[PDB]
């Protein structure tokens with residue numbers, strides 16, 4: 001369970017993400033797909049993309065990043081009270097998309113890496129620990145929903 005102070009560190013770096021969520025999403029997705037190419041495999045709409053240049057030029061990838069980051073931001077803004085938001089996300093990701101929890105950890109690592117690089121002013125050590133705590137809680141709760149939905 002996060003403290004209010006930890007939530008505020010999460011939300012103050014998210015405020016900078018929101019200056020340009022599309023650009024942040026491109027960086028995060030490119031980082032994810034380069035570090036863990038198997039994640040890109042899971043995304044039939046994007047898996048043809050071969051290079052970073054193609055990824056930066058893909059309007060679908062950009063839109064994908066905006067949708068994903070905006071849904072994560074809505075979860076973070078609930079400061080742990082995110083049961084309603086996780087229900088549909090867990091169901092689609094466990095049952096249709098078939099995204100293992102480990103791939104959500106990979107995505108979490110890409111988020112942290114990009115915030116660290118782009119936002120040293122709001123992603124110092126304490127802020128990065130708060131973000132990690134928030135993403136671990138997200139992953140914990142969505143893993144519990146995965147199990148309830150019949151996926152392990």
Ligand code: HEM
Nearest residue numbers: 039042043044045067068071072089092097099103104107
């Ligand atoms: C914080 C983590 C994530 C969030 C908040 C998130 C959010 C979303 C949202 C809002 C959608 C659209 C509605 C839906 O289908 O549920 C979506 C679709 C999708 N997501 Fe995720 N996602 C996350 C992680 C991932 C990861 C790591 C992968 C793959 C490695 C993934 C694969 C997909 C796919 C394949 C779709 C459908 C894309 C299509 O329409 O062609 N998601 N995600």
